[PDB]
Amino acid sequence: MTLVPYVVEDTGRGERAMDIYSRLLKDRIVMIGQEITEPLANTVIAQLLFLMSEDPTKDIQIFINSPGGYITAGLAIYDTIRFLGCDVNTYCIGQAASMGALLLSAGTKGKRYALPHSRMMIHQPSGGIIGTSADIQLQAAEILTLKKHLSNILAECTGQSVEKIIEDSERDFFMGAEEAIAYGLIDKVISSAKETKDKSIAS
Amino acid sequence: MTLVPYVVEDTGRGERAMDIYSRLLKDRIVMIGQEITEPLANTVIAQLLFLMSEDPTKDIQIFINSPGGYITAGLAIYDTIRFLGCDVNTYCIGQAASMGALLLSAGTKGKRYALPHSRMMIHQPSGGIIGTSADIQLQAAEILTLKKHLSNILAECTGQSVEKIIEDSERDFFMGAEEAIAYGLIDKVISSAKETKDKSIAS
Amino acid sequence: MTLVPYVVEDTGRGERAMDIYSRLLKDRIVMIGQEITEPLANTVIAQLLFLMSEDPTKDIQIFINSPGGYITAGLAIYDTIRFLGCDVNTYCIGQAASMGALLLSAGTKGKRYALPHSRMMIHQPSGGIIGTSADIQLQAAEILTLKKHLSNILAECTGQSVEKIIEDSERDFFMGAEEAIAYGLIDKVISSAKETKDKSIAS
Amino acid sequence: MTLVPYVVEDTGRGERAMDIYSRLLKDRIVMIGQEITEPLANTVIAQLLFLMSEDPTKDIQIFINSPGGYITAGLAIYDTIRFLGCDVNTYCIGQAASMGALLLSAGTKGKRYALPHSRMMIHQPSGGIIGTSADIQLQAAEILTLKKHLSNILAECTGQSVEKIIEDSERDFFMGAEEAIAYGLIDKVISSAKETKDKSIAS
Amino acid sequence: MTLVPYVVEDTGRGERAMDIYSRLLKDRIVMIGQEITEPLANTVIAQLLFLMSEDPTKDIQIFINSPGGYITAGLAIYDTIRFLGCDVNTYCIGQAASMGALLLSAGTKGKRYALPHSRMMIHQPSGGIIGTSADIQLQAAEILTLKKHLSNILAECTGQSVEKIIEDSERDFFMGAEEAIAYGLIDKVISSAKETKDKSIAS
Amino acid sequence: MTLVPYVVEDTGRGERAMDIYSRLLKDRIVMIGQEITEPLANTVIAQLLFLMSEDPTKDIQIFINSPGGYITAGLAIYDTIRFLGCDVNTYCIGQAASMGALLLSAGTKGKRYALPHSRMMIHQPSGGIIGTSADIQLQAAEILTLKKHLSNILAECTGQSVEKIIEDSERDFFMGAEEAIAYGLIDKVISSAKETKDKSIAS
Amino acid sequence: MTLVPYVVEDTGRGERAMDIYSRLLKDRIVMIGQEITEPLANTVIAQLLFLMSEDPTKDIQIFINSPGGYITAGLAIYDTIRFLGCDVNTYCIGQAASMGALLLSAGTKGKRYALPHSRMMIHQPSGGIIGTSADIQLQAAEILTLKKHLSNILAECTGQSVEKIIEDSERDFFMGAEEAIAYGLIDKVISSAKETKDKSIAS
Amino acid sequence: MTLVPYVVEDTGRGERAMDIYSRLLKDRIVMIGQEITEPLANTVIAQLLFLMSEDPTKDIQIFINSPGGYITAGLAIYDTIRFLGCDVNTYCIGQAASMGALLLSAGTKGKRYALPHSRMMIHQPSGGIIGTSADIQLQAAEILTLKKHLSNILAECTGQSVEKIIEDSERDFFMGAEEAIAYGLIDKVISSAKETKDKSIAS
Amino acid sequence: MTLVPYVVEDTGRGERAMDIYSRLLKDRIVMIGQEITEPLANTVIAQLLFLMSEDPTKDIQIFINSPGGYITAGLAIYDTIRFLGCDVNTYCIGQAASMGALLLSAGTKGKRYALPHSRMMIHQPSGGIIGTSADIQLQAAEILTLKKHLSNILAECTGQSVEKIIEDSERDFFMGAEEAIAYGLIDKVISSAKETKDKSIAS
Ligand SMILES: CC(C)(C(=O)N1CCN(Cc2ccc(Cl)cc2)CC1)S(=O)(=O)c1ccc(C(F)(F)F)cn1
Ligand SMILES: CC(C)(C(=O)N1CCN(Cc2ccc(Cl)cc2)CC1)S(=O)(=O)c1ccc(C(F)(F)F)cn1
Ligand code: NA
Ligand code: NA
Ligand code: NA
Ligand code: NA
């Protein structure tokens, strides 16, 4: 019973019947509240490519509540985030585990936020190289390359060494918002709207 | 099997087709009428983020009829509620158990209401502590952290000690509207619109 | 279920209500983000034939994230791509295996790109004689013609010999963006707007 | 995962929901990309009858990628195509087996095309037909009559004898675009719009 | 909790628990009470070959209540019945349609019986000449061969001409025990054990 | 779910395990406790044919609790009951509707019994016709013969005219044990062992 | 639908409960009455290896009614048949298509039989070489080796050339018992027994 | 689909129903004819541990027809095979891929056989993890250890270098019986009884 | 579908059929080859309680190939193992993770073995709520208590500190047989039956 409410308005002379997620997309807000799967990667990348078509310079806000995902889908989104020319804001509401922590740390330095009770983890809890039979088929020398990619990206994003990233990816523990700042995953804890999201009319 | 009714008003030039829940969202009314799950949390946070992107100062009304949920989803919604800059009114119609009681007590102090026959409980039945179906990855120190977060938030919201909150979270009992006022969960019992802040409609 | 967000443009008060993928199609962007099946081939060819009807000379961008597919569907899309009179840009986001690599290499020479962490393979992964239509069909001597067709097309697109393509098609390994340039599958690696070489001029 | 794309205008302000297949239908393009079943025949005949209501003289383009089908549905579409008063262009993208080859050869002589790597077969793929939820169920003397009809029609369309059509219909082999021209199934192999490089032939 | 009741007697040389159908097999009684399918034909032929393995000279009784079946399965059983060296008694209880009518008429002349209210039909009610492995159906010259085989066997068994058998196979009507004797399908109506060539199998 | 208790035996030199229904079959007791379907008729006829193979002269007891069934299956059992040479005792426990009433009245005259609260009906109840709910087979002019067969048999068994049987088959009402005696369906109401024969000689 | 009768038989020493197929296995009779799949090959090979352990010199009779199968399973059974040291008799009841025809022709030359109305085909129907959705499935050069193996075995077994076997494997036609003798598939058509346990009666 | 014929034989006078696979187990024959999964490994290891309890010195025959499997299950069986003190004979009937080839090459040197048309491959055609609980993740250093174990064991069993084993495990090709002898996977191709160990040793 | 083989024995007294697992149970061998769930624990404890009733002094061998399980089931089995009075031998074939490692280390000191390529982990790979009623019961302070119990038992069994057990339970890594000896999980690596104790002909 997943009710998907809509939005449309009369503060002027208008219309615009769209659902709630398309509305937030009008403010350049992208929601990641899934497991990071291949069908999600396509929808998020599609949203990211569209937002670059509209204004390739305005900031984009990404809100992340993800229990994990797959390396193949996460790497696709990360490369798309790096492919963008504008600044990307990443907010962690709730949990950002494994791939969620990768995309969270992939935001523009200084614009990666978390909420006071957010929890973040680098360990991949689910999906041993392949998880559910929806996303399958990874040989040997291929998971190492994807894991080597993930370790190198996390080390670059956080500022830790690749060795430390590998060691901490083996530990099944979450870290709080304050710990994640020290680790390099995020930049600031917030408790009210950081007005980095402010736009009303384009320019 | 329960029909999502639609709505059409008389703004003259604008005529606008939305369902009943999107209509209530136009009055800054958010409905929580089911278990607090991860997909529901995403919808509720999306609604909350949209309502702040439209009027970040106008009051928001949240109506809660929830048999419970998961701590991770509730903490995400609570942090989003605290993330808002405007006042939040919480109304308990029917039942607000565990996570429903958390969001109910999370409203702005003085603006937390319940109906005469409402029932409220802080005890979390079963193992509703993370995520959704499956999503049951634990370690030890993570349940301790999530329960410590919930106990600390409930103690702050209600005004009771953390020890009392933990002790009462172990008891499977409901409390009425009058008891919930004494406990600190809510502020006032109501039975009509004017029992809240009254704007003095003429007669 | 994956929420496919919708879109609303400017300068007119009306009611589009088109999704994100149809929106990108307005910019002549075609998304291939799943297995290359017969129903998918119909979608891509329909998109390709429509884009030729609107402007048969403007460039078309194809974004590819495909774990593989079937030769029967791949050959249909390739012939349609060669059937186009305009330039085709192919971008590999994530993975392009077997049929994904065929369509990726089918783009206009100089306009085949990949992202820094993309993975490409010509081997048909994890199984497959190719061909399922509620019935396998494609007897022995028919798969040979299709495999010979695929080998000849890959050799023509990449620049390698047919013998090398056949030898490399039996090896279950992926190659990175730099290796794929040397191989002939793609032309350029892409990681920023100023490092494009694509220079997306439109709208 | 599904067939997504939609279409809107350019020659005004942009408001009406058209999917990709109805869009191509506005250019009098009919897509046959699956097994020739009874529900498909109804849709195709409905499209054909509609296209005749708008212009009984405008040319109609039919694109065929079909692994086969049933005699009852194929004969119905063929009779409807012969029922049209305008010229019918048939394009074979990918595979046209049995019923696909019948409808492909049913186009106006001189306007039956195939793509360079297309494969065509007159044999009923896999097995014959008696009907399992797709051709109902057929007595003895009736499948012979329907098979005789198909043999007689193919001989007239291709120019071969009825004996050779029956004689070749038992052989499970595909033929290429060049072989199909010699056989009489099609007229020209192409690599650009309609008659290669132009909506009309030059000499 | 097992259906198909069990039985015990034959205390002479001593034996154990068998089901009811195995009991009748001890009296050389074979039951055909459902559609003549390929798995049923295998069971019946296995039973037919076993009774010939024990003593190839004692009479065999076949009781038939079959609404029809497939020609491939019926021809297999008929050839196995003709392959036997002993006399075969066929009894029609209830209905013997199409394939049931062939096996009924395949008994030794003079030992084909029916009960007073039995109904017999030569028509196959629209569908089924082959069991099929959920993959395959039949070419033209293959239905013709199977129909010729069925017509020739029925003409030989009943004594009618092949033309009349073909004509009557197109008519969807049942015939009674008296009509079936005149037709040649059976030999005698019995309506009791002690009547006619068999005076019951008792002991 | 339909627990079928088992039993173990003295009365021969063998020793063995059967369920409760197979045991009652050793006392020549046949249970009919469900709808008269084609698979049930085969089981009942198999039991009847086996009981004749052991003693074609000893009495057989049939206990009937049937809400109805189909004429094709009922006629098969009735003809098999008439095929027996020994006396058949029919007992109605609970309900005997349509086909159940046919088999009940088919017992040897004087040996058809019912229990004090049993209910009997000649009307064919809610549902399907003569055969199977989905696999349905008789065609035109076949209902006349099958209904005439049922009317003629009921008239002979009960002693009423065919006209009265046809008229009473049209009314949806049950009759008690005393009414069924007057009607001719049964002979005696019973309530103790001595109401049976139990003529002489120990057992 | 369990339709496997059991035996406790008359004509044996002792007391045992085996099903009908195990009974025929005691006479060294192996039944192949369904599609040649991988699980079937394992059971058949198990039966073949058991029969060699019991008496590695006594003849084995195999009865074949198979609509086809897969090359991998067919090759496994054929190699096991060649692995046996005793003579193998193959009987074709009904149909022996593709793999069934391979195993039929694999019997000892001079001891391959068919019934008068049997139908045999060497064409591999439908398509594929293993797989219902993803069963095994093979790369290119591996299915070719299996097809070359099958062609070479059929040519050796029948006596035809490899070229003719390849040509006839592409033609969807059946041949009768007399035609199959001329082709080399079988040796004799039969209509009466020739097996051992002859010239004697039981009891 | 579990057709598993039974047997009752000379473990005495002959009185016990066992299936065909347990039958070969009485001759110390173990069948591996399906995917090597965790439940299969438990059954096979249980069979292996039982066979060592009965006679820890008598030879064991293992027949292998396996399309592949999982590393964890294969390693478990191999360690159990190496744990045995007696000689193990491995026969490859049909296909032995990846894990099947591991167990095949794990037989006692000199006692590893294949049939003339058997196909063997060391490449894992599917890959991925084993789903041991379908809930997990598999880190880096664990796939490396499992792949290193497989490479080291295959190199020791075959005699090739670990580097060659790694290179050939990436190539999707099968090898014939003669090629597998040269490779070291097996020792002899067979077509009759061939080798054994019961006599004075050759020298 | 693994075909759990059956067994036949006692060539002196005769007649019993047990499966392979019940067979090994007669040798006081208990197999744990799956996830340690509540239904599995009941079977294992039942086996353990039976084995103590027959001989409460003879050694018991437990073979473990378990990817994990639930604490409630693991604690139940462990307490039952400690409840036994006889020596318990634990063998790790393949993998012993979390609960499997608990039961493995619960064997009598000096009699805990592993195979050369076995892998052992104390970390619970993904879950840990533990329990029943759709996988979710068991409140917070109760999972913490059960985890404390598990840490205390592992520390006592292995010899490490409780702090080290807690620290290592959070690390997702496997250790080999040699590492497990140093850690305290096991005592000896083995590679053949006769590496420990002595078994020969009885007296
Ligand atoms: C059948 C045996 C005895 C055999 O192979 N022979 C080979 C060669 N013989 C003559 C020979 C000798 C040397 C040379 Cl140079 C050439 C020819 C004689 C016997 S067997 O291999 O012992 C065997 C196979 C299978 C089974 C089982 F599967 F049933 F268990 C049991 N035993
Ligand atoms: C000790 C072993 C090696 C053995 O050989 N035995 C033989 C006979 N026995 C007879 C018996 C019967 C009944 C009873 Cl009451 C008592 C004794 C008992 C044991 S073992 O424990 O079987 C064993 C250990 C490890 C492995 C592994 F490593 F492969 F996994 C496999 N087997
Ligand atoms: Na609680
Ligand atoms: Na590279
Ligand atoms: Na009464
Ligand atoms: Na013939």
Numbering used by the authors:
A (entry chain J), B (entry chain H), C (entry chain E), D (entry chain I), E (entry chain K), F (entry chain N), ...: 1 to 203
Which text from the study accompanies this structure?
Caseinolytic proteases (Clp) are a family of conserved multiple-subunit enzymes found in bacteria and higher organisms that have become an attractive and novel therapeutic target to combat infection. ClpP assembles into tetradecameric barrels consisting of two heptameric rings. These barrels interact with hexameric AAA+ unfoldases, such as ClpX, ClpA, or ClpC, to unfold the targeted protein and facilitate its entrance into the proteolytic barrel. Proteolytic activity requires alignment of the catalytic triad through conformational changes of the handle domain that composes the interface between heptamer rings.
Here, we report the first crystal structure of full-length ClpP2 as an inactive homotetradecamer in a complex with a candidate antibiotic at 2.66 Å resolution. The C-terminal loop of ctClpP2 that includes a mini-helix, α8, is situated such that it acts like a lid toward the hydrophobic pocket and mediates a neighboring positive electrostatic environment with residues Lys197 and Lys199 in addition to residues Arg28 and Lys58. While activation of ctClpP2 would have been expected when analyzing drug-bound crystal structures of ClpP homologs, we observed a misaligned triad and thus the inactive form of ctClpP2.
